[PDB]
Each structure stands twice: as C-alpha cells, then as structure tokens.
Amino acid sequence: INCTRPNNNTRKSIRIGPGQAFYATGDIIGDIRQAHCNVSKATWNETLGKVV
Amino acid sequence: NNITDDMRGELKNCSFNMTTELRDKKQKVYSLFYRLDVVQIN
C-alpha cells in the first residue's frame, strides 16, 4: 500500500520566545489536494479471499 | 481556493495574537490548521 500527502507545505517558525519557538504551517505551494492511500485491488481481493 | 462548497473547507487560515520574546509587545501572526484541530465557539 502507498500513502501520500499531496500538499507540499511550508514551515513558519514564529518565535514565542525567549528561547522557545513554535512551528506553524505556512502557505501551500501547488494544488489543494487531500491525503490518500492506494491498495492493489488484485492483492487485496486474493488476500481477503484467502482469509475468508 | 475555488470551491463549490462540498469541499467543506477542511483547512483553515487562522490569525491570532501571540507573545513575542519580550513581555510588552503582542504579535499578530497567522498559521494554518486542519478542521479536526480547531473548534468554533458561539
């Protein structure tokens, strides 16, 4: 199975201070897509059929 | 984005006040959070 996060992201390092820094998500570059996972239909069909 | 309305936002562009290195000055910075991370009140 293959899982991906299409949204290539930006880290924004805002400083709460004095030595403590919070990391915030910056603006997205590219398209707005949602994460997803792929499972080989053939592999899953046989695997389920062997379990049943 | 350019959304019909079935995308239900999901991603939120939040702006807020923040404490800087110094005590005196506030910080008006913005971030990005998922809908499952935030909740609106009233």
Epitope: P6, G30, D31, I32, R33, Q34, H36 | N1, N2, D6, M7
Partner: antibody
C-alpha cells in the same frame, strides 16, 4: 462554414433594458455553447456569461443581477438582455461559440479538476452606445 | 505595455499575475479594428491553422507568470494579445488580463 452576425439598437437611454440578438448560421444553437463578450474602447474584454440550450447557464458575478441570457431553438439565434444600463455599459458586444475542456491536475476521483472554456469562432460584433 | 522585437527574432509576452497553482492559460490575439482570435488554449496547445511559431509556457510551473513565445517575428504578428488565467487556486476570472502590444521594429 460558420457565420455569426450580431444585431442591436446601437443607442440606449439609461436605466433601460438593452436587447441584443445574435443570428446564428452554419450550425444549430442546441448542439453548442454560446458566450457574450463586451469590450470598452481602450480596455480589455470583459466576459459577460455563457449559455447552453439544455438550460445550463452562468453569469458574470459583477453583472449577475442585471443580465439575462436565452436561446431561441425555433429561430436558431441568441438573445441578450441587460436591465438597468448606465454609461459604463457603453462597449462593443460580440457573440461567439464556446468549446469546453477539462484540466486534470490531481486525482480525478477527488474532483480537483476544473473545466475551462475558450471561444474559437467570433462574430463581427455590434456597437452599443448607452449615452443619455 | 509594449514589446518591440526586430523582424525574424523572438518575441515574448507576459500577462496576468504569478501562478499559484496548476494553470490552463488561454491566449488571444486582437488585430486592431477586428474581433479577438484564439491562438493557444491549454498552456501550449495550438488549434488548426495556427503556426508552431506560437508557443506558450506550461501550466505546471508554480511561481512564474504566463509566457507567450513567438518565434520568427513578422510584421503580421503586430497586434494586441490578451490572456485568460485559469488557476486551481483562484476563482473564475471573468476579466481577461491586461493585454500586450507587439511592435515590429521595421
């Protein structure tokens, strides 16, 4: 093919209803998309909106509550309507065929594909002066 | 805006804002006193009748403006060129970008 001919009044008083007609020749009005584009003197063309025979039809958000489009399948022509005209509507109105396309960038199942329109066949156009 | 290019050279035209997402830029050419004509739809796909001298920048580049390249500049190419931006991140543009006039130096 395909010949298009626009026809209108040419002069409109303010706060009135401008009516234009786009005579279509060489094709049917039912099997194609139709768009209107106006262009002021010395300005960039502004899209008014697109209309389809089935009933699919969208307008310009800036001129949404003032414009009205329709298609006559019996006479095979296009008709534009603009209520509440001012001096800003004084431009050259063109009628033009419209072909659709689909730009896919992500995974089609999740949507993330937007349909883009483009005009290929233009008409001569009609000049409309809305000066009181 | 104006762009003057020597005949036979290469002309380049910039229109609209910087790309924020995957685009599908539609180019149009307007001869003075005539109606606007289609040149390149879908970034760099030219329809029938249009020479391959006209090429457009691919709409997969993020952070760059749409670019129209015209090789073998001739006097007949001297006109107004407008562009229609279709970004996945921006709403539908009901207004063409500010056009650019091509000047043949002869």
């Amino acid at each position: 093919q395909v010949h298009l001919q626009e026809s209108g009044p040419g002069l409109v008083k303010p706060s009135e209803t401008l009516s234009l007609t786009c005579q279509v020749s060489g094709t049917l009005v039912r099997d194609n998309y139709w768009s209107w584009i106006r262009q002021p003197l010395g300005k960039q063309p502004e899209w008014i909106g697109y209309v389809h025979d089935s009933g699919d039809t969208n307008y310009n958000p800036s001129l949404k509550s003032r414009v009205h489009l329709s298609l006559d399948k019996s006479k095979n022509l296009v008709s534009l309507r603009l209520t509440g005209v001012t001096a800003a509507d004084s431009a050259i109105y063109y009628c033009a065929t419209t072909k659709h396309g689909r730009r896919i960038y992500g995974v089609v199942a999740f949507k993330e594909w937007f349909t883009y329109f483009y005009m290929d066949v233009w008409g001569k156009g009609t000049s409309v002066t809305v000066s009181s | 805006t104006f762009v003057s290019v020597a005949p036979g050279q290469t002309a380049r035209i910039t229109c609209g804002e910087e790309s924020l997402g995957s685009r599908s830029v539609i180019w149009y050419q307007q001869r003075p006193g005539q109606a606007p004509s289609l040149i390149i739809y879908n970034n760099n796909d030219r329809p029938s009748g249009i020479p391959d001298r006209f090429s457009g920048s691919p709409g997969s580049t993020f952070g760059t403006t749409a670019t129209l390249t015209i090789t073998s500049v001739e006097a007949g190419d001297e006109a107004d060129y407008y562009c229609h931006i279709w970004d996945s991140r921006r709403p539908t543009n009901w207004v063409f970008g500010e056009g650019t006039t091509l000047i043949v130096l002869s």
